[PDB]
Write a protein that binds this ligand. Sequence first.
Ligand SMILES: [Mg+2]
Ligand SMILES: [Mg+2]
Ligand SMILES: [Mg+2]
Ligand SMILES: [Mg+2]
Ligand SMILES: [Mg+2]
Ligand SMILES: [Mg+2]
Ligand SMILES: [Mg+2]
Ligand SMILES: [Mg+2]
Ligand SMILES: [Mg+2]
Ligand SMILES: [Mg+2]
Ligand SMILES: [Mg+2]
Ligand SMILES: [Mg+2]
Ligand SMILES: [Mg+2]
Ligand SMILES: [Mg+2]
Ligand SMILES: [Mg+2]
Ligand SMILES: [Mg+2]
Ligand SMILES: [Mg+2]
Ligand SMILES: [Mg+2]
Ligand SMILES: [Mg+2]
Ligand SMILES: [Mg+2]
Ligand SMILES: [Mg+2]
Ligand SMILES: [Mg+2]
Ligand SMILES: [Mg+2]
Ligand SMILES: [Mg+2]
Ligand SMILES: [Mg+2]
Ligand SMILES: [Mg+2]
Ligand SMILES: [Mg+2]
Ligand SMILES: [Mg+2]
Ligand SMILES: [Mg+2]
Ligand SMILES: [Mg+2]
Ligand SMILES: [Mg+2]
Ligand SMILES: [Mg+2]
Ligand SMILES: [Mg+2]
Ligand SMILES: [Mg+2]
Ligand SMILES: [Mg+2]
Ligand SMILES: [Mg+2]
Ligand SMILES: [Mg+2]
Ligand SMILES: [Mg+2]
Ligand SMILES: [Mg+2]
Ligand SMILES: [Mg+2]
Ligand SMILES: [Mg+2]
Ligand SMILES: [Mg+2]
Ligand SMILES: [Mg+2]
Ligand SMILES: [Mg+2]
Ligand SMILES: [Mg+2]
Ligand SMILES: [Mg+2]
Ligand SMILES: [Mg+2]
Ligand SMILES: [Mg+2]
Ligand SMILES: [Mg+2]
Ligand SMILES: [Mg+2]
Ligand SMILES: [Mg+2]
Lengths: 55, 123
Amino acid sequence: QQLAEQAQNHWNNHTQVQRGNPVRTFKGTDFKSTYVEKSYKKERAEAKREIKLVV
Amino acid sequence: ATVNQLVRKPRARKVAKSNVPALEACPQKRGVCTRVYTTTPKKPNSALRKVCRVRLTNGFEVTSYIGGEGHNLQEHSVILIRGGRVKDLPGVRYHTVRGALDCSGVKDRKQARSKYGVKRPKA
RNA sequence: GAGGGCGCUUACCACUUUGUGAUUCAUGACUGGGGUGAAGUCGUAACAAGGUAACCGUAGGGGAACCUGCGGUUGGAUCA
RNA sequence: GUACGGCCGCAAGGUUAAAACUCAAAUGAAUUGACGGGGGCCCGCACAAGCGGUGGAGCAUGUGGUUUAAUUCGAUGCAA
RNA sequence: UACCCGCAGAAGAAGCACCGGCUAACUCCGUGCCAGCAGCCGCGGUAAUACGGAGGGUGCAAGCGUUAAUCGGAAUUACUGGGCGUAAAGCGCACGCAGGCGGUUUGUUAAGUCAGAUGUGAAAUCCCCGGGCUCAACCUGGGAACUGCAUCUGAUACUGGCAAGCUUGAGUCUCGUAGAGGGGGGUAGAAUUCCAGGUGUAGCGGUGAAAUGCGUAGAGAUCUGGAGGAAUACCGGUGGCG
RNA sequence: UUAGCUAGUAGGUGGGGUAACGGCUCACCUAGGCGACGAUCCCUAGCUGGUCUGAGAGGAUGACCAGCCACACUGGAACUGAGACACGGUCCAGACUCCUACGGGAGGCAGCAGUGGGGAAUAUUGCACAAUGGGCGCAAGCCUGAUGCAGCCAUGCCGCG
Ligand SMILES: [Mg+2]
Ligand SMILES: [Mg+2]
Ligand SMILES: [Mg+2]
Ligand SMILES: [Mg+2]
Ligand SMILES: [Mg+2]
Ligand SMILES: [Mg+2]
Ligand SMILES: [Mg+2]
Ligand SMILES: [Mg+2]
Ligand SMILES: [Mg+2]
Ligand SMILES: [Mg+2]
Ligand SMILES: [Mg+2]
Ligand SMILES: [Mg+2]
Ligand SMILES: [Mg+2]
Ligand SMILES: [Mg+2]
Ligand SMILES: [Mg+2]
Ligand SMILES: [Mg+2]
Ligand SMILES: [Mg+2]
Ligand SMILES: [Mg+2]
Ligand SMILES: [Mg+2]
Ligand SMILES: [Mg+2]
Ligand SMILES: [Mg+2]
Ligand SMILES: [Mg+2]
Ligand SMILES: [Mg+2]
Ligand SMILES: [Mg+2]
Ligand SMILES: [Mg+2]
Ligand SMILES: [Mg+2]
Ligand SMILES: [Mg+2]
Ligand SMILES: [Mg+2]
Ligand SMILES: [Mg+2]
Ligand SMILES: [Mg+2]
Ligand SMILES: [Mg+2]
Ligand SMILES: [Mg+2]
Ligand SMILES: [Mg+2]
Ligand SMILES: [Mg+2]
Ligand SMILES: [Mg+2]
Ligand SMILES: [Mg+2]
Ligand SMILES: [Mg+2]
Ligand SMILES: [Mg+2]
Ligand SMILES: [Mg+2]
Ligand SMILES: [Mg+2]
Ligand SMILES: [Mg+2]
Ligand SMILES: [Mg+2]
Ligand SMILES: [Mg+2]
Ligand SMILES: [Mg+2]
Ligand SMILES: [Mg+2]
Ligand SMILES: [Mg+2]
Ligand SMILES: [Mg+2]
Ligand SMILES: [Mg+2]
Ligand SMILES: [Mg+2]
Ligand SMILES: [Mg+2]
Ligand SMILES: [Mg+2]
C-alpha cells in the first residue's frame, strides 16, 4: 500500500513523458469521435431550405 | 369547459420554474471555482469544453461554462456567473462572465469584445 | 379622624424551565428504482403472420427482454 | 399513474397523487417507397431433368499474408 | 443661477452589437468535429456567408450588448377564447344527496335585470383639450374616466319568488307481446375420465420428425354395467335481453 | 397529500370595566358557535391608488409619489397625556457593545450623512432655513438632516452636439 501511494506521488513528481525512441508502436484509430450522424434528415433539410431561400 | 366546472375549480395555469435556479433571480452571482477542467460534450458535437465547478455565495455549487479562447481560471479563482445554457453540455446552465473579478478577457479578440471583457485596442 | 404613601400580600403576566408530541430542513452505512452518457456483454421481446398475432387486467414462473394460465380487445396478416 | 402521505384491503394490491432530473421532440392520420419467414400472377440454367466440371494433385496466373533494400501503384462482396 | 451678449478655432467630443435561417447586412484569410460558437435548429472532420482575424455592410448611438425578471407571442389553462373515437383527454356501469338547470298560462311581487337620479369612488396616474419651461422629458388648468358600491324613483320582456293553473315532459292504471334479464330448486341427452367385467392381441399415443409416457402384470380397440364432475352440439342468427 | 375546529368557546341574566357597544372581564344558566359557500392547520405576504405587459379580458406586480396599516435592538408592561402603551420618553427581562475604583452604570441610525458587513448592485459624514410646511412664541425670532438645494453615478426618460 505504501508503494502504491508512493507511486501516486511518483506520478505527482516526475510523471511527464520523455518523448523519444518509442519502445513499441500501436496502430489504432480512435479517441476523438466516430460519429457520422447518418440521419440526413436535418443536414439535407436545412440545405433544402437554404436553396429554396436563395433561388 | 363548462362554466360551473370552472366556477368550482378555475383554470389552473402552468406553474413555470426557472431554468437558472442557482442565480435566484439575480442577474449575476459571484462564486469560487472549486474545480477548473474540461469536459467532453455529448453527441453529435465533440470538443473539450472549458468549464468549472463553482461555489456561489448563496451556497449552491454549480457548473459554469468558460467562454472564449483560453483562460486564466484556476482553483479558488473568484468569478461571476451570469446564467445561460450550454446545450451540448448536460447540466451546465451558467456562463462565466469574462472580465469579472478574476477572469481576464480573451487575449487578442478584436470584435465582439464586450461579451468577453476586452478593452478597445489602442493604436 | 378621613385619606394618601411605603411596605407586605394575592391576581394577570414576559424571561426561563420541564416532559412529551408534531412538523420541516440537512445529513446517514446500506439499499430501490429512474434519467443521462459510451455503446461494451447476453439474448432478440415488439415492429411483416416480426417468424408463438399483439396488447389489456390478473396469477404464477424465469439471467433479461419476457414465458405460461383465465377472461377481454382488434389497436391482427392470410382465405387465391 | 411512480414515490411519499391519506382512505380501503386479510393479502395481492386498489384509489388519490406529486417532485427533482432529462429530451426537443413524443404523437395522430394519411402519402411515396422499400421490406415481409404476407397474398396473387409471370419470368431467369432458378430449381428440377441432364452433361461436364472446381475444390484433391503438379504446373501457370493473380491475390492475401509474410519477407526484403524494394518486393512500384491501382482493383479487393456479387460488380477485386 | 436661468437666460443674453462677445473671442478663437473644426477646434474638445463615436462606440457597441450583429451579418446561416429565424433577422436587416457577405467576402477573403487562419483552422480543420481542434480551437471554439450556440436563443431553437445547429455550425466545426480542408475551398466554413454560422468558429478567430480583416474588408465590407446592417441595426442601434452616448450609448450599445449580455444576463436577471414580468407580460406578450402562448387561443400553450381557451371567461372573452381550447379540446376529449384514434393525437393528452368520457369515470366500468348505474342509483342518488348537496349543486347547476328547467315544459307551458294568467296574475301578483320586483330579487336578479334595466332606465334615471343622489352620495361616493382622495390627490396624483392613464386618457382628452389647452398653458408654461427655446421643444421634449418635466411641470400644469379644465374635463372625461375611476368600468364599483349603497339609497331613492321608475320599467316588467326574461330569469327569480308567490298564488292559481294546463298537459305536450315525466309517472300511474287496463290488455297483451318478445326476450340466454336475475335468483332458487329439479331434471335430460351426448361426450370426457375412472372402476368392474367380456372379447381380443401387439402395439397405442404423439409430433415436422421423435422421444418421454401407456402396453404381454394384456394396452390401444370394441361391448356391457357402474360412479362422478362440468358445459349445454343442432336451434344459433352482424338474433335477443341486460 | 391540512377535515374537523372551538370551554370564555356561542348566547343569555346579573355584576364589573371602557371615552364608547361588546365575553372586554367575572359569576351563574343554557349547550351552543365555526366548517365543503373551505373551518382549522402549514407556507408565502404589508394593503391600496397604481406600475409593467396586453387589442381586450386578463397575467404579473405593489420601487418612487400619496392614503391606510404595522414596527422602533428582542420580549413584556404601563405612566404622563386630548392623543402613545410612545423611533431619538419610562420600568423590567434578554443578546450584544462600552465604562468601572468591580460596588455598579451607559447605549439602541428600520431619522440625515456615514462606517464595517452581506451582496451582481444602489450616492455626500455638503449648503440653507431664502421659499413651502411644522413646533413654541403677542411678536420679533429660535428650532426644523421635513423641505428647498447642491455633490456622485449614462440608472431611466427627454433634448442637443
Ligand atoms: Mg432538419
Ligand atoms: Mg411475442
Ligand atoms: Mg421477435
Ligand atoms: Mg421464435
Ligand atoms: Mg408474436
Ligand atoms: Mg403484434
Ligand atoms: Mg412458463
Ligand atoms: Mg400505486
Ligand atoms: Mg402512424
Ligand atoms: Mg412485398
Ligand atoms: Mg437442377
Ligand atoms: Mg488448393
Ligand atoms: Mg487443385
Ligand atoms: Mg500488388
Ligand atoms: Mg470477377
Ligand atoms: Mg461580426
Ligand atoms: Mg437576410
Ligand atoms: Mg458570434
Ligand atoms: Mg472535413
Ligand atoms: Mg477556409
Ligand atoms: Mg450567428
Ligand atoms: Mg393567455
Ligand atoms: Mg410567456
Ligand atoms: Mg388544443
Ligand atoms: Mg396511442
Ligand atoms: Mg388516447
Ligand atoms: Mg365508459
Ligand atoms: Mg319558465
Ligand atoms: Mg331591484
Ligand atoms: Mg342603475
Ligand atoms: Mg382620482
Ligand atoms: Mg407649449
Ligand atoms: Mg315570473
Ligand atoms: Mg287529460
Ligand atoms: Mg352585561
Ligand atoms: Mg414580510
Ligand atoms: Mg392576448
Ligand atoms: Mg420596546
Ligand atoms: Mg438594527
Ligand atoms: Mg397634551
Ligand atoms: Mg391618562
Ligand atoms: Mg404605536
Ligand atoms: Mg434612532
Ligand atoms: Mg441612513
Ligand atoms: Mg449616535
Ligand atoms: Mg458601505
Ligand atoms: Mg461584497
Ligand atoms: Mg462615497
Ligand atoms: Mg422654513
Ligand atoms: Mg437644533
Ligand atoms: Mg447624463
